[PDB]
Nucleic acid binder design. Structure first.
Ligand SMILES: [Zn+2]
Ligand SMILES: [Zn+2]
Ligand SMILES: [Zn+2]
Length: 133
DNA sequence: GTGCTTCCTGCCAATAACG
DNA sequence: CGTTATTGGCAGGAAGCAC
């Protein structure tokens, strides 16, 4: 067991721009609009927590970067098109497909795709993957 | 330039600590 | 369920690598 603490540290600095408070990493002076985003980033400098793969000996500095890489190892077709029903492994291939085949914008107000949960590997499952209508 | 893969980062929900 | 602190999954393209 360890003694819990509820304190901040000098691992960043604040910079006010156009009224907005930004948070900046001390090492590389990268700016962030959210502290949550900054904390995620600082793990790339500290290497306090490693995120090693299962199928190879590779290590990532972020949990989500590992997960997305492992989705490419397993081949989980998360993104399904709704126009032609075709399934894709990530957003980048899906967007390219919808543009080249259907000549439509998935970031528009049509919504021509649906996201299915990942079952090939273990992750937290948001209630919008479970069932939405 | 075309094609494959990983990185960036605000946004949002989930986890943990304390009541 | 209400605050404080961090994890870490999502959208969507830019950047890097291969040709
Ligand atoms: Zn930094
Ligand atoms: Zn791997
Ligand atoms: Zn389609």
């Amino acid at each position: 067991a360890n003694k819990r603490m509820k304190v901040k540290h000098d691992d960043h600095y604040e910079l006010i721009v156009d009224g907005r408070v930004y948070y900046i990493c001390i090492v590389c002076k990268r700016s962030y609009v959210c502290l949550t985003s900054l904390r995620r980033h600082f793990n790339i400098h500290s290497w306090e927590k490693k995120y090693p793969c299962r199928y190879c000996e590779k290590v990532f500095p972020l949990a989500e970067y590992r997960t997305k890489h492992e989705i490419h190892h397993t081949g989980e077709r998360r993104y399904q098109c709704l126009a032609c029903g075709k399934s894709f492994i990530n957003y980048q291939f899906m967007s390219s497909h919808i543009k080249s085949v259907h000549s439509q914008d998935p970031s528009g107000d049509s919504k021509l795709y649906r996201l299915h949960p990942c079952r090939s590997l273990q992750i937290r499952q948001y209630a919008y993957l479970s069932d939405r209508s």
